[PDB]
Design a protein around this ligand. Structure first.
Ligand SMILES: N#Cc1cc2cc(CN3CCC(Nc4ncnc5sc(CC(F)(F)F)cc45)CC3)ccc2n1C[C@H](O)CO
Length: 466
């Protein structure tokens, strides 16, 4: 509206007053995305961007919030004439969605850093004329809600956002950019990307938000970072409380990554009486398995990161093997570079560092070491198997010799007598990739044949002439 009933909690004088507003809005027929994003962006601005003057909490006065709300609704209602786009069926048209996307896009500053923090909310859009990529999608959905377009909803993958709309909510439209130096496809469907089985479009097993999930998205999108070294405790607490509110109401059920976010927050500062981080990471995975065909990577990455921080080598390795077992059934496509980066960093930085420490601890007499556990070696092998299987049939390769040195080093961290105990069947392990099947022969020698491994991993044909 803003409607009278939306205004009665103001002024918001604390974290808990913000929580009450969210609870009130989530109890309404449709939570007001615009209101909520403006409030979050306001409080984030004054807790993370500019803390000058801060004594407890930046009080959000109704006059201030209502004026920001008015700037937004005036900008959208002025620029989008609904009469030009008649709605057949209580549903929106592709032209209307494109128009709203154009209105948001055309309002943005000409030149700015798109990867900066704190440009996710409608507060940033109004006061800074700046949004990040998924921020533009969210703003399109808020604008559509403000316009009364109840069928337009946010669609999310693990690295991209777009909208669904139309008859049965079955249409897709691009409304923002993706990445850097990719040509935009605004207005188009996502069908080509689904059909090519890229990770970016999750084989169609992406999130189709309802309004409550769009609230969950804006909560996940809070950025407590003040700088590289420092987070706002106030925003961490707000985000954590809002995620628990959403959890209790059922609205994280279909949102794996929100569960991982919440688990990470609980690891940092546990809430008494709540599930442990591990329970929450596993609920995230269960959500992915239940609702999304187990085709998501981050629920497993979140779990592995927790085990890695807690130096639980065995369970970290298991979780990264599970990440690989998901990726193996995708094709590595242009625009998938963010997941390539995750796998690269895990293989070539995180695992090596973990195993280096484990090696030092073994030298010092640790018992029950992952490096003496053939099941742990099997997890390492399954991780590489999935990466190799991912590469099969992909339009672009994954592996190169830059990965090979780290593989040799990681294999070598396990003594031959440990490696010998894994049974590779056509611990027991089965390989899906042809690369790993050919490598089987090399995996039990006391001293690993490094050159032969390299040749098998990169499928390098030849060795040096001279
Ligand atoms: N092991 C491990 C590991 C855990 C881990 C955890 C993260 C944390 N990251 C996980 C993904 C999260 N992303 C999200 N969280 C909630 N909702 C959404 S909707 C969306 C799509 C888009 F942005 F809207 F377009 C993304 C996204 C943001 C936080 C990143 C890399 C991680 N890794 C890999 C590690 O950094 C390798 O160095």
């Amino acid at each position: 509206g803003l409607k009278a009933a939306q205004k009665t909690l103001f002024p918001l004088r604390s974290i808990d007053d913000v929580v009450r507003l969210f609870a009130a809005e989530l109890g309404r027929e449709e939570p007001d995305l615009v209101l909520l994003s403006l409030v979050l962006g306001f409080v984030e601005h004054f807790l993370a961007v500019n803390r000058v003057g801060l004594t407890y909490f930046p009080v959000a006065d109704l006059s201030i919030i209502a004026a920001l709300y008015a700037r937004f609704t005036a900008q959208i209602r002025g620029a989008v004439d609904l009469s030009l786009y008649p709605r057949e069926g209580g549903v929106s048209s592709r032209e209307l969605v494109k128009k709203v996307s154009d209105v948001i896009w055309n309002s943005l500053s000409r030149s700015y850093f798109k990867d900066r923090a704190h440009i996710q909310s409608l507060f940033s859009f109004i006061t800074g004329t700046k949004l990040d990529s998924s921020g533009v999608a969210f703003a399109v959905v808020g604008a559509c809600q403000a316009l009364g377009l109840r069928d337009v909803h946010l669609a999310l993958s693990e690295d991209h956002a777009w909208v669904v709309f139309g008859p049965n909510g079955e249409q897709t439209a691009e409304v923002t950019w993706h990445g850097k130096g990719n040509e935009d496809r605004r207005g188009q469907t996502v069908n080509a990307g689904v059909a090519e089985r890229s990770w970016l479009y999750l084989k169609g097993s992406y999130m189709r938000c309802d309004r409550k999930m769009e609230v969950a998205f804006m909560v996940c999108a809070i950025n407590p970072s003040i700088d590289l070294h420092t987070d706002s405790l106030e925003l961490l607490q707000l985000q954590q409380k809002l995620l628990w509110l959403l959890y209790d109401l059922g609205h994280l059920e279909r949102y794996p990554m929100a569960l991982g976010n919440l688990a990470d927050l609980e690891e940092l500062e546990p809430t008494p009486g709540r599930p442990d981080p591990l329970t929450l990471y596993h609920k995230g995975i269960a959500s992915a398995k239940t609702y999304y065909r187990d085709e998501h990577i981050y629920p497993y990455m979140y779990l592995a990161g927790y085990h890695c921080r807690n130096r639980n080598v065995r369970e970290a390795l298991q979780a990264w093997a599970d990440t690989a077992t998901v990726i193996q059934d995708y094709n590595y496509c242009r625009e998938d570079e963010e997941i390539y980066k995750e796998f690269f960093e895990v293989a070539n930085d995180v695992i090596p560092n973990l195993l280096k420490e484990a090696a030092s601890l073994l030298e010092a007499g640790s018992q029950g070491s992952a490096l003496q556990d053939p099941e742990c070696f099997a997890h390492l092998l399954r991780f590489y198997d999935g990466i190799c299987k991912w590469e099969e049939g992909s339009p672009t390769p994954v592996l190169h010799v830059g990965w090979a040195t780290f593989l040799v080093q990681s294999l070598g961290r396990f003594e031959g007598q440990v490696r010998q105990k894994v049974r590779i069947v056509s611990p027991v392990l089965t390989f899906q990739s042809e690369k790993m099947k050919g490598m089987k022969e090399l995996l039990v020698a006391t001293k690993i044949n490094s050159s032969a491994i390299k040749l098998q991993l990169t499928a390098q044909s030849q060795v040096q002439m001279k």
